[PDB]
Motif scaffolding. Structure first.
Motif, PDB file in Angstrom:
ATOM      1  N   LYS A 148     -16.792   7.805  -1.298  1.00  0.00           N
ATOM      2  CA  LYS A 148     -15.434   8.727  -0.309  1.00  0.00           C
ATOM      3  C   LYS A 148     -17.057  10.083  -0.194  1.00  0.00           C
ATOM      4  O   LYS A 148     -17.953  10.862  -0.561  1.00  0.00           O
ATOM      5  N   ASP A 149     -17.591   9.878   1.210  1.00  0.00           N
ATOM      6  CA  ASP A 149     -18.447  10.668   2.084  1.00  0.00           C
ATOM      7  C   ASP A 149     -17.628  12.297   1.907  1.00  0.00           C
ATOM      8  O   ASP A 149     -16.661  12.676   2.330  1.00  0.00           O
ATOM      9  N   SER A 150     -18.002  13.350   0.786  1.00  0.00           N
ATOM     10  CA  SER A 150     -17.674  14.813   1.020  1.00  0.00           C
ATOM     11  C   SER A 150     -17.477  15.408   2.147  1.00  0.00           C
ATOM     12  O   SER A 150     -16.924  15.914   2.440  1.00  0.00           O
ATOM     13  N   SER A 151     -17.930  15.314   3.107  1.00  0.00           N
ATOM     14  CA  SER A 151     -18.596  15.998   5.058  1.00  0.00           C
ATOM     15  C   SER A 151     -17.821  15.367   5.118  1.00  0.00           C
ATOM     16  O   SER A 151     -16.546  16.117   6.281  1.00  0.00           O
ATOM     17  N   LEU A 152     -16.706  14.041   5.217  1.00  0.00           N
ATOM     18  CA  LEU A 152     -15.662  14.081   6.004  1.00  0.00           C
ATOM     19  C   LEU A 152     -13.772  14.414   5.777  1.00  0.00           C
ATOM     20  O   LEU A 152     -13.497  14.524   4.005  1.00  0.00           O
ATOM     21  N   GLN A 153     -13.483  15.371   6.242  1.00  0.00           N
ATOM     22  CA  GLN A 153     -11.906  15.523   5.772  1.00  0.00           C
ATOM     23  C   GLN A 153     -10.918  14.945   6.020  1.00  0.00           C
ATOM     24  O   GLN A 153     -10.264  14.831   5.286  1.00  0.00           O
ATOM     25  N   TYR A 205     -11.320  -1.322   5.269  1.00  0.00           N
ATOM     26  CA  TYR A 205     -10.311  -0.610   5.886  1.00  0.00           C
ATOM     27  C   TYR A 205     -10.614   0.449   6.576  1.00  0.00           C
ATOM     28  O   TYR A 205     -12.212   0.987   6.502  1.00  0.00           O
ATOM     29  N   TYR A 206     -10.441   0.642   7.383  1.00  0.00           N
ATOM     30  CA  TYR A 206     -10.319   2.795   7.642  1.00  0.00           C
ATOM     31  C   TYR A 206      -8.657   3.282   7.007  1.00  0.00           C
ATOM     32  O   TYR A 206      -7.690   2.495   7.340  1.00  0.00           O
ATOM     33  N   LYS A 207      -8.797   4.592   7.253  1.00  0.00           N
ATOM     34  CA  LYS A 207      -7.806   5.120   7.388  1.00  0.00           C
ATOM     35  C   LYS A 207      -7.880   7.032   7.908  1.00  0.00           C
ATOM     36  O   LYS A 207      -9.040   7.462   7.211  1.00  0.00           O
ATOM     37  N   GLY A 208      -7.190   7.214   8.352  1.00  0.00           N
ATOM     38  CA  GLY A 208      -7.506   8.618   8.654  1.00  0.00           C
ATOM     39  C   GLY A 208      -5.791   9.748   8.688  1.00  0.00           C
ATOM     40  O   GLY A 208      -4.318   8.729   8.537  1.00  0.00           O
ATOM     41  N   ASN A 209      -5.332  11.115   8.050  1.00  0.00           N
ATOM     42  CA  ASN A 209      -4.255  11.547   8.430  1.00  0.00           C
ATOM     43  C   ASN A 209      -4.839  12.662   9.128  1.00  0.00           C
ATOM     44  O   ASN A 209      -5.615  13.762  10.032  1.00  0.00           O
ATOM     45  N   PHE A 269      -8.623   9.778  17.142  1.00  0.00           N
ATOM     46  CA  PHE A 269      -9.123  10.974  16.408  1.00  0.00           C
ATOM     47  C   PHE A 269      -8.552  11.389  15.438  1.00  0.00           C
ATOM     48  O   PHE A 269      -7.258  11.695  15.751  1.00  0.00           O
ATOM     49  N   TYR A 270      -9.461  12.101  14.831  1.00  0.00           N
ATOM     50  CA  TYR A 270      -8.076  12.621  13.488  1.00  0.00           C
ATOM     51  C   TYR A 270      -8.896  13.633  13.239  1.00  0.00           C
ATOM     52  O   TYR A 270      -9.846  14.342  13.148  1.00  0.00           O
ATOM     53  N   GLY A 271      -7.938  15.163  12.401  1.00  0.00           N
ATOM     54  CA  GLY A 271      -8.362  16.474  12.190  1.00  0.00           C
ATOM     55  C   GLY A 271      -7.644  16.960  13.733  1.00  0.00           C
ATOM     56  O   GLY A 271      -7.365  16.458  14.600  1.00  0.00           O
TER      57      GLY A 271
END
Length: 505
Positions: free
Chosen positions: A73-78, A100-104, A234-236
């Motif tokens: 897990k890349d710690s800079s990706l929120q 996979y990819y995912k986002g929130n 786009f996420y965030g």
């Protein structure tokens, strides 16, 4: 009358291709072929409904792998994560793993005009092709931790040795033009270029293979096929990060990517409203939405808000709960609002709430002047010792009416919201218009209003200085909507409203 809905073009119905539907994320199994079925393609791509970045798809499965290898897990990706979950010492007929990819937090605001570079990684799985004709490589021990590359078992980016392969991504987004360009690279070699257009908080487009020659044997090129199925989001809350995928047009490759921009204090504009007011707590929460106000996502499941009625009831089972939504209105195309509760059958409605979703007008399309009337309806609950409700209806003379005077020239909006048979409105609104939205205050009259229209039993409820906010929706700002809520000892309210621009005669 003396007003009627302005005639407006209907929203052009759209059908996205099978690979082009928005979702929080997607995951696919690495293909495995055999002597009997020597070519096995990318298939059975699965939607992800869990946006939690700490949960990797099929994590539990991976406990049985010879050498579980879950990409770090890349710690800079929120807000996003892409990668793989594979057996790094894969053997026999057991599964190889997943990509996979995912986002929130799908973005509800985008940067206004700053040209932004998102940087990150990409990952992939090939298909499985045992055919002698295909000429896939047998032995590349300096390149990969396995033999018979992509033959019986799809090749995964996680098979590659970092000394010879590093899959990195870079995208440049021009938010002013809603265009994206970029490159997927392997160390200092370009593997694909990408092009996409932004709609809502998603992008759709193509990946162009940089080397169109497949070759053969040791020089076999896994990345020769183009894709017309690039799709991501786009996420965030302000599109801080992005993630997505594509599939090769011949189903020989599934690629995923995630990246984050390096901008500071970026000016943004709203594209979407989608929120829910809980009527027991009078608290607000965000709904996941990708830019279609007619898709309401509840506990991960999509509800399509379409129907013949002025309002329409939808009764849907989601994770063993029976959810009911009543959505308004048949005359609004770029927003939806209404009521949402849980009601088993059974037959008692519980955990009642309100929702509003809207697709904001592009700020360049907001009228620069003029004065207009908007008319619509609302859903609401007001509570003190007693309860009182507004239920969306189409009786414009006596119903739960809303009316607004909108002055685009002076950036002013005011409004009235009515009880059924009400002479004077129970709430008024006064705010300012900024770009494609407005914010201001809701209040009652000085005397307030009685919650039970039959008893003189309690003091009238009164409200002052209640925050109201909302927006203009659709290509010409012919629709508006918004919401307000408040809770204290002196009374509670939750309210959602919508209204259509009017023309005289």
């Amino acid at each position: 009358e003396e007003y009627k809905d302005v005639e407006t073009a209907k929203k052009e119905k759209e059908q996205l291709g099978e690979l082009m539907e928005p979702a929080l994320g997607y995951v696919v199994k690495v293909p495995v072929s055999s002597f009997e079925n020597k070519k096995v393609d990318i298939s059975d791509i699965e939607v992800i409904t869990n946006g939690n970045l700490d949960d990797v798809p099929y994590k539990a499965n991976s406990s049985k792998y010879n050498y579980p290898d879950i990409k770090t897990k890349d710690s800079s990706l929120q807000y996003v994560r892409s990668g793989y979950v594979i057996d790094g010492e894969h053997s026999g007929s057991n599964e190889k793993g997943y990509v996979y990819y995912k986002g929130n937090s799908p973005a509800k605001e985008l940067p206004v005009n700053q040209l932004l570079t998102y940087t990150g990684s990409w990952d992939f799985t090939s298909n499985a092709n045992l055919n002698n004709e295909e000429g896939r490589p047998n032995y590349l021990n300096d390149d990969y931790y396995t033999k018979f590359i992509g033959k019986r078992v799809g090749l995964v980016s996680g098979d590659a040795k970092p000394a010879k392969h590093k899959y990195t991504s870079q995208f440049e987004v021009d938010f002013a033009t809603k265009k994206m360009t970029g490159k997927l690279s392997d160390k200092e070699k370009t593997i694909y270029t990408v092009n996409a257009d932004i709609r809502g908080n998603r992008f759709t487009g193509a990946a162009t293979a940089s080397d169109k020659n497949k070759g053969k044997g040791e020089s076999y090129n896994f990345f020769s096929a183009d894709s017309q199925s690039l799709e991501g989001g786009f996420y965030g809350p302000k599109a801080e990060e992005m993630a997505g995928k594509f599939v090769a047009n011949d189903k020989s490759l599934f690629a995923v990517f995630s990246a984050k921009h390096n901008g500071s204090n970026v000016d943004t504009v709203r594209i979407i409203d989608a929120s829910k007011i809980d009527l027991t707590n009078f608290s607000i929460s965000e709904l996941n939405n990708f830019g279609d106000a007619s898709v309401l996502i509840i506990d991960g499941k999509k509800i399509k808000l379409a129907g013949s009625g002025f309002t329409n009831k939808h009764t849907i089972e989601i994770n063993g709960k029976t959810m009911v939504a009543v959505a308004c209105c048949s005359n609004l195309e770029y927003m939806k609002f209404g009521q949402l509760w849980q009601q088993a059958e059974g037959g008692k409605p519980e955990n009642n709430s309100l929702f509003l979703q809207g697709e904001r007008t592009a700020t360049d399309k907001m009228p620069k002047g003029g004065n207009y009337k908007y008319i619509g309806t609302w859903d609401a609950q007001v509570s003190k010792e007693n309860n009182w409700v507004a239920t969306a209806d189409d009786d414009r003379k006596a119903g739960y009416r809303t009316e607004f005077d909108v002055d685009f020239g002076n950036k002013n909006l005011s409004g009235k919201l009515f009880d059924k048979n009400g002479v004077n409105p129970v709430f008024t609104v006064d705010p300012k218009i900024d770009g494609n939205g407005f914010t201001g205050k809701a209040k009652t009259s000085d005397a307030g209003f009685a919650l039970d229209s039959g008893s003189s039993r309690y003091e009238n409820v009164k409200f002052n200085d209640v925050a109201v906010s909302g927006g203009f929706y659709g290509p010409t700002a012919a629709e508006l909507g918004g919401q307000f809520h408040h809770k204290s000892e002196n009374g509670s309210v939750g309210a959602v409203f919508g209204a259509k621009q009017q023309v005289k005669k």
